[PDB]
């Protein structure tokens, strides 16, 4: 999680003064939660036995992420 606060600094503001953040008059802070990358909980593969022919392979894999896609 991070907190965001910033503002515009004009030509008057100096690098040292900007670091001091004295005259900047920054914006109020705001807190947001940073999402989590996907991970795979387990890897597996199972298929149905068949009397005639061959069982089609399939992969079952369980994730734990929160990505949109």
């Amino acid at each position: 999680t991070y907190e965001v606060q910033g503002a515009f600094y004009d030509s008057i503001i100096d690098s040292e003064l900007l670091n001091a953040q004295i005259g900047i008059n920054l914006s109020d802070k705001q807190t947001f939660k940073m999402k989590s990358a996907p991970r795979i909980t387990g890897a597996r593969c199972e298929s149905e036995p068949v009397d005639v022919g061959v069982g089609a392979p399939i992969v079952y894999i369980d994730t734990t992420g929160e990505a949109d896609y």
Binding site: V50, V52, G53, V54, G55, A56
Partner: protein
């Protein structure tokens, strides 16, 4: 007659009413095969008929990666 050897084209066994039709594959897979013992008619390829009457159209994934439908 292929060179100095002879390749089977079709066979009709006496003990079993099995009739293999077609030149044999390098691995020995006959194109069309029959078996009254198992009461099955085995044809690799396609079958064209005006109509078909049956009691169970059980689609099968005959090949490793086929899509029955």
């Amino acid at each position: 007659k292929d060179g100095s050897t002879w390749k089977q084209t079709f066979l009709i066994d006496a003990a079993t009413g099995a009739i293999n039709i077609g030149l044999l594959d390098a691995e020995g897979k006959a194109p069309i095969s029959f078996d009254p013992v198992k009461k099955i008619v085995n044809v690799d390829g396609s079958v064209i008929t005006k109509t078909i009457n049956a009691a169970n159209f059980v689609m099968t994934n005959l090949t490793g990666q086929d899509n029955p439908a």
